[PDB]
Amino acid sequence: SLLNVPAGKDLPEDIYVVIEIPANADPIKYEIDKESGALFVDRFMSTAMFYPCNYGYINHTLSLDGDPVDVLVPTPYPLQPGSVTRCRPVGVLKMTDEAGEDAKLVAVPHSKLSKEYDHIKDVNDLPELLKAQIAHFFEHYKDLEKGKWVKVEGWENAEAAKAEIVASFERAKNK
Amino acid sequence: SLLNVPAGKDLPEDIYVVIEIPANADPIKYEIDKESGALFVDRFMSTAMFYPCNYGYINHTLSLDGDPVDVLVPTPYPLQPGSVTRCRPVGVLKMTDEAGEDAKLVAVPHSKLSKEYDHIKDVNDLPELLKAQIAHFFEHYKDLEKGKWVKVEGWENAEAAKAEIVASFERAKNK
Amino acid sequence: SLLNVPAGKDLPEDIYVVIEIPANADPIKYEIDKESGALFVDRFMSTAMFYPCNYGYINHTLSLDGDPVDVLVPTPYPLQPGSVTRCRPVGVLKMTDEAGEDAKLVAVPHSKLSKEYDHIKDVNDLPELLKAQIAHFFEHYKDLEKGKWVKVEGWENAEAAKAEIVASFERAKNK
Amino acid sequence: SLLNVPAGKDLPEDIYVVIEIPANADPIKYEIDKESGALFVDRFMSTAMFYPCNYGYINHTLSLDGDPVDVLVPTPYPLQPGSVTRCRPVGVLKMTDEAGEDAKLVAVPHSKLSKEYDHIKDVNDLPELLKAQIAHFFEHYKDLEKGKWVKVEGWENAEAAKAEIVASFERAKNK
Amino acid sequence: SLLNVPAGKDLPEDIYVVIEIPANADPIKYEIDKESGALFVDRFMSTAMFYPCNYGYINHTLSLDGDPVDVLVPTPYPLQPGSVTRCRPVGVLKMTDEAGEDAKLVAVPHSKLSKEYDHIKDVNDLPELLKAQIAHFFEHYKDLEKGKWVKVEGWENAEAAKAEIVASFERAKNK
Amino acid sequence: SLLNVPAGKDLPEDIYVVIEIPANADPIKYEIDKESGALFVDRFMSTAMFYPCNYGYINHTLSLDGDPVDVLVPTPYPLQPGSVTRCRPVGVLKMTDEAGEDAKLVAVPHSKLSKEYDHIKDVNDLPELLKAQIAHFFEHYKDLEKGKWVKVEGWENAEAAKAEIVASFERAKNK
Ligand SMILES: [Mg+2]
Ligand SMILES: [Mg+2]
Ligand SMILES: [Mg+2]
Ligand SMILES: [Mg+2]
Ligand SMILES: [Mg+2]
Ligand SMILES: [Mg+2]
Ligand SMILES: [Mg+2]
Ligand SMILES: [Mg+2]
Ligand SMILES: [Mg+2]
Ligand SMILES: [Mg+2]
Ligand SMILES: [Mg+2]
Ligand SMILES: [Mg+2]
Ligand SMILES: [Mg+2]
């Protein structure tokens, strides 16, 4: 099932990301249930906004906010919910919210899946417009939700992203 | 697995519905197989009709017609086949066909998912139009099938829908 | 799980196909992982081409290329990745590629799902345009992938398709 | 503009149909305004039904119901509203409603646009299932509309369809 | 042409809105060009936001900001760019930006198109959620543009929306 | 009408492209009719291929094949048939077919519509995958159409594209 997908073939450089929410989709926040491994609806978003990239997580990790590391994955076409994509991390958006530090990594499709992203090696290589749209989405998508708040802190590089992956894999194995 | 989802967190007021067919989708009737948990195509509908709401069932229940309780769930955007939604029952369409009594519950998204449906408490709070569209769909969607027949008896209120969930949950323990 | 779907209710005339790629979809090649049962992204296709029918495999078979038998299934509307369809084989497109025989079966929805395909009994009953489109898709969709190539050899009849199903079932059963 | 499209290159065998409503679309009835030539919304349908084929009309015709001849056009993929498709008539569904005799012709794409339909020469050549779904749609799509009623009378052949085209072209030119 | 559509059949209670951007669509801002009547791309939006309702204007009007009156129209399914819908005004969101006063009217489909919106007579009958989503969209959709700024002032009632339509219709006569 | 859209605000650097076929759409080839200005269906393509970018033409130009200059325009989301986009030429794919030279320009959205394409100044700035996909599409999409064929000759730079625009404008102006 989805509960037994590996964190990656070779962490933290070569990872698997379990997709929860397709890029450019309707505003429904899905999450994979840790118990059943099924796709649950978490929320129908109240702002008229959509996740800008496919969104999911790395299995067998535990971040500082209490859940698996969250990852955004840009692709040429949107992926299915519940699919597993091989990726390489290039960057991270740091932000805090009610859950604690809730970082969003960015990882692009591995060169075996496509050579389209081979030229993206670090956070400075992502399009400026994509980075701005991602930050603006996390700054505002919860603006109409009652008990919730976000502060976006800013972008860090691929080395920062990989260290969060190592740390969160270490934390799950112990914890 | 989808076979391991709970009936609900606090039945019968707070339930989980496993979605089989999205609202406003192509006329493919899917059903979750009890053996595998996999989504099986049951039928390509011959009428040019679509389910007016998302359609699914409550896991770990056994209605009078031999299957899990069937539920319609209105949402602001259509859900994925195989996803699980937390809901509150608000009424039931009673109908008979060749499985016997084949009532269709209506449940709305739980207030944790959306504020949109908080003001819907009972069957008289559903829009008249949506009730008429649901009854008309179930009256006509198997018109070009066989020896199927449907007789719609009418709407009952939330207290009756809750009785059907408890009876069918307690029923399935036993069998 | 998808892993425990049967090959068929009555091989070789009545089989189950596990769908990986919907008809007329974006050009993403999904595969079901044999260990986890999850949907993995295999490749983002570089050609501007789409599978002309839903594409999947018969579980618990082992074909001459080392993988379950591959099957195309025409339907009136596209199926979800991960779904299972009951089908009847009508024909096979023999082709070789870069490690070996890699035939593609064609199978139509079973008469219990729809009467639409009842008149298609054999490969001569498939529309000619459809067969030309399938063979053109397989001839060209890996054209931009450097180490890959495809030789299409031609269409054979349902008797040939059914022989392959039984032989491939026995190969998996006995290994 | 759309107001100056010809009825056809060679009536009644070779016609143009102006598409108003795409096949397999949401339940919105559009109509081309005779004054402005713009696409107007005529109705949001209240049943959960969808037109089974692309729907439109032949320009410069005037049927017995007071409007241009209505035509259904099956295609491999849905057409855009406001597009013009070259067709050959193969059949007609006769029905009466509040407007009078309101026949719905069926015409398939001309062989210059595709050879897919070249084998459809008359009403008996259309799939049985398509004809049944078309009749059932016109029998029921107005069931929830207040001041409206339909009686479906039945199918007639291509010669009947072409005579309605000749008659309605004659009636417009005079009237 | 779309340039020849009337402002309305009985202004200001009964109007026509020409639709430019569908509800819940990709973030392409279209506008009808006054010269040609053609649909022109005005902008690819940089935010990951979508218009929460269909968006368009009333033809043959001239508001204080130099353009036709702008109108949001909620519908049960999204409309086509360039289509024309008969509506009734129910309120107005007052806001200023760099065109000056750039109010956005809300109008619902006329009762001849749908019974769904009959019970909405004035601005307090719109769902609170939908009003909040509209205000939040207009507050944030140009966040990543330039020297644009928006200040939302608040909702006024149907009597004020009707005054703005008459003033702008009578205005455009003159100029 | 579409017929009176200008070639450009400042040829050849700043042009308007009238879109006929959206990116990533079903395989229907639309063309704008030069007499009526309507969208006509030209062909249902028999290959399982899609245009890899939006496709259209510059109005009031006359290229060496007797038709307005053809243009592909990459956008972040697909455009509506019949829409007009302001663009800047970056390159041209020279090709011959069965009556003559039939070059295809590539032009990107103008910086007033989006900053995304500002860094694409010339043909060497287009992603290599994209150029390979375009050339592969034009090499193969008429493969099943008996009297048609295509020889791709290669990519030339923006200076070559702009020469063709001006020459083709002068040809239409002077004929
Ligand atoms: Mg969207
Ligand atoms: Mg997460
Ligand atoms: Mg987190
Ligand atoms: Mg059921
Ligand atoms: Mg039941
Ligand atoms: Mg496609
Ligand atoms: Mg194989
Ligand atoms: Mg539909
Ligand atoms: Mg008509
Ligand atoms: Mg009529
Ligand atoms: Mg405006
Ligand atoms: Mg304005
Ligand atoms: Mg040309």
Swiss-Prot record, chains A, B, C, D, E, F:
Amino-acid positions noted as binding substrate in the UniProt annotation, renumbered to this chain: 29, 43, 55, 141
Q: Does the keyword Metal-binding apply?
A: yes
Q: Where in the cell is it found?
A: Cytoplasm
Q: Which GO terms describe its biological process?
A: phosphate-containing compound metabolic process
Keyword Metal-binding included in the entry's annotation: yes
Instruction: Tell me which UniProt keywords the record has, alphabetically.
Output: Cytoplasm, Hydrolase, Magnesium, Metal-binding
Q: Which coenzyme or cofactor does it need?
A: Mg(2+)
Q: Which residues bind Mg(2+) 1?
A: 65, 70, 102
The UniProt entry, under PROSITE patterns, shows: PPASE
Predominant location of this chain? Answer: cytoplasm
How would you summarize the oligomeric state and partners of this protein? Homohexamer.
Role according to the record: Catalyzes the hydrolysis of inorganic pyrophosphate (PPi) forming two phosphate ions.
Protein name as catalogued? Inorganic pyrophosphatase
Biological source species = Escherichia coli (strain K12)
Q: Report which gene this protein is encoded by.
A: ppa
